[PDB]
RNA sequence: CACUGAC
RNA sequence: GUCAGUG
């Protein structure tokens, strides 16, 4: 389990992503409204983004809103301070890549 | 440098 | 080998 559930967010611009807070949590349809909330991690040349569930990926270790570079912290309202260990990541030899997608009204930054 | 996946 | 993810 390896890999982000979601494909890339690729910058095509020199602004990295950032989201409006309520705003960034990929859509899942087998998640539950606890459930969304995460970091986005920086891995053509354009720098690529990916969605990691708090509590997993490589930043498991991080609380919520901890500043780190090249991090990006999202929520939905609603959602709960806790990891998600029933979510986890994703096997790439089990599972392919959930395709990211973001609800209408979500602000994407340029480039992006 | 290493491990894994896809081709 | 190539591309990609991760350490």
């Known amino acids: 389990n390896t890999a982000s559930w979601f494909?890339?967010?690729?910058?095509?611009?020199?602004?990295?992503l950032?989201?409006?807070?309520?705003?960034?949590?990929?859509?899942?349809?087998?998640?539950?409204?606890?459930?969304?909330?995460?970091?986005?991690?920086?891995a053509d040349l354009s720098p690529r983004w990916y969605?990691?569930?708090?509590?997993?990926?490589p930043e498991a270790g991080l609380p919520?809103?901890?500043?780190?570079?090249?991090?990006?912290?999202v929520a939905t309202e609603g959602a709960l301070n806790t990891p998600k260990d029933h979510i986890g990541t994703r096997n790439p030899a089990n599972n392919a890549a959930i395709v990211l997608q973001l609800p209408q009204g979500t602000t994407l930054p340029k480039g992006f």
């Open 18 to 42: 950032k989201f409006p807070r309520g705003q960034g949590v990929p859509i899942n349809t087998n998640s539950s409204p606890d459930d969304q909330i995460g970091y986005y991690r920086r």
């Open 7 to 16: 494909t890339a967010l690729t910058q095509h611009g020199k602004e990295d």
């Open 51 to 57: 969605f990691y569930y708090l509590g997993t990926g």
């Open 64 to 73: 919520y809103g901890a500043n780190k570079d090249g991090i990006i912290w």
